[PDB]
Amino acid sequence: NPGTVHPQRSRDQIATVWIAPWVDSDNAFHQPGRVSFVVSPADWVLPARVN
Amino acid sequence: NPGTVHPQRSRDQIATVWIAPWVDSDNAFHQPGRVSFVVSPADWVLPARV
Amino acid sequence: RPGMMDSQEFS
Amino acid sequence: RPGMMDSQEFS
Amino acid sequence: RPGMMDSQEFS
Amino acid sequence: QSPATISLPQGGQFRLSISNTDPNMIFIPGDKVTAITAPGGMLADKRLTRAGGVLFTSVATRTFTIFVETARGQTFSVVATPVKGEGRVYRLMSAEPPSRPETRKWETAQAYEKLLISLNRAVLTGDIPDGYGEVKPLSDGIRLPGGFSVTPLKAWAGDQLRADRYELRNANTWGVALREQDFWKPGVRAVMFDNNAQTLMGGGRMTVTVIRGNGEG
Amino acid sequence: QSPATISLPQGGQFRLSISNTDPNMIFIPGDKVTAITAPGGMLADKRLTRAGGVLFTSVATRTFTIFVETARGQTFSVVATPVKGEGRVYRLMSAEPPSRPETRKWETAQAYEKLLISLNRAVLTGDIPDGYGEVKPLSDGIRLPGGFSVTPLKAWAGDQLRADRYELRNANTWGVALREQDFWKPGVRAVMFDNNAQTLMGGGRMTVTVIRGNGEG
């Protein structure tokens, strides 16, 4: 019979950057916060071994 | 005379709001912080003489 | 000639 | 002549 | 050639 | 090395050595040299460098006076003694700053954040933006840490967002620090506290404005 | 060999070896050389490379000063003494970042939090925005808690913002929790840990990217 593999999807890798307090153009103070973005998304990991 | 005292200015009123976390169009996740901003400004006032 | 001064103005 | 350098730029 | 310096302005 | 920095009042005169063998530079940061004058025959060649500055060479052996004029109207004088060595570079500074440009805040907040902030400010003052016609408030919005009873007062409903005001009752007798995220309920965009929080005491009735989406369930 | 790095402020005077026999090269990582000026009859040939460098040959033998002016406004002076040998290549780092007017327009057109994310992604993903250029990293731009030592790696700078990467080594070998807020300094605008971290093992070679402001201080 032809073989079987298990599709494996890799986890997303995330990155979080802390932001320091800041004032915008409308003079509202922004206390320190953080924003997260995904650097490398999830994908199928083709099989090391078919059988 | 009651008027003509040296003038003083009041302190602006400031209010803080808390923003719940949200997700941007580009899928960037924001977990921001409370923003303190002036709501009421200051004005001139004549202090009561001591 | 003595006493004269060179001066250049840059555009 | 001494110190000069040949250089060709390819189209 | 006295005092002259080589000033090549490249385009 | 770093260019030698000299601070001079207008018409100021500084004694600096230059070089006979190699080109010398004088730049005023933020300023463009528009003119240079020296005793005749003293300066062999004068060229304007990128971003202002003057490049100059001297074959002279006698101390001389150079007058440099910048484009902002400043004129400075230098007494130059020519000596053997590397070309010397000097940074010209002004002792008294002429004007103080006001600071520019260039940072811009996000559209969603500004929208919530504008509304919260409008509600705090009470003026109504167009498209906000008023509505009955809910009871869904507020979770209570404890000792708090909620009564709805006023509420606005618009095209995209919704705001409401609830007054919490005085808590029992333990001081209750107030956490703005301790009144959260799924679906709420922003929660803000009137006055300054910092622990409502053995009591106190404080109005809280809660902001929630509109149309969306 | 790897090109040697000069790193000079915008008045710099660096004494460097130059070769009489073979062509020598100077490049700016982020700027295009527009002119090289030396004493008359000193530099035999001078041609501008396409990338933005300059190739030159010197036939004379005396030590001399040469001046380089880049397009985006910059001037660096090197004293070159000719010696027998191979052509030498030098990489010139600015030390004081250049004003980039055409970059402010892109910088301010977007929102602040979006720009921060974008610079941080670019440094992490290894692609640099077009308007930014390479600069010498700051010696001390972040606070150092818990007896740490930091080795700078790379820095880039635009008009109002400036990114740098710092390698952090834990020296106390006892486990130290990591908080971006503990590295904050007046002017540090944002901090990101490349590995999610939250902890630092006793021997740690990790990295951190900090965005600051250009001209703070």
Distance from CA of B3 to the nearest CA of A (A): 35
B10: left (phi over 0), alpha (psi -120 to 50) or beta: beta
Residues of chain A contacting residue B37, judged by C-beta atoms under 8 Å apart: 26-29
Distance from CA of G142 to the nearest CA of F (A): 22
In one letter, which amino acid is A33? G
Q: Strand, helix or coil at F4?
A: strand
G8, G13, G75 ranked by CB distance to F49: nearest: G75
- Residue F84 has what DSSP assignment? S
Maximal CA-CA distance, chain G: 64
Do chains A and G touch by CB distance (3+ pairs < 8 Å)?
A: yes
**Smallest CA–CA distance from D2 into chain G, residue:** G59
Closest CA to G192 of G124, G98, G114, G93: G124
How far apart CA F43 and CA G201 sit, in angstroms, is 64
Chain E residues with a Cβ under 8 Å from any Cβ in chain F: 2-5, 7
Residues of chain F contacting residue A24, judged by C-beta atoms under 8 Å apart: 105, 107-109
F23, F47, F91 ranked by CB distance to G39: nearest: F23
How far apart CA F191 and CA G65 sit, in angstroms, is 66
For residue F78, which phi and psi values (nearest 5 degrees)? Answer: -130, 140
Residues 87-116 of F with CB under 8 A from B: 110, 112-113, 116
Task: Determine whether the interchain pair G44/D7 forms a contact, defined as Cβ–Cβ distance below 8 Å.
Answer: no
For residue G122, which phi and psi values (nearest 5 degrees)? Answer: -65, -40
Cβ(G33)–Cβ(G53) under 8 Å?
Answer: yes
Sheet containing G4-5, strands listed edge to edge, beginning at the edge strand earlier in sequence: G4-5, G89-91, G24-27, G54-58, G43-48
Show the tokens assigned to F119. 């509304």
Cβ(F177)–Cβ(F148) under 8 Å?
Answer: no
Chains with ≥3 Cβ pairs under 8 A against E? Answer: F, G
| Alpha carbon of residue F119 to chain centroid | 25
Which one of B18, B23, B31 makes the best mutation probe of the A interface by having the most chain A beta carbons within 10 Å?
A: B31
How far apart CA A1 and CA A50 sit, in angstroms, is 12
Cβ(F4)–Cβ(F16) under 8 Å?
Answer: yes
How far apart CA F55 and CA E5 sit, in angstroms, is 9
Q: What is the secondary structure of G130-154 as a DSSP string?
A: TT-EEEPPPSS-S---SS-EEEEEE
Distance from CA of G59 to the nearest CA of D (A): 5
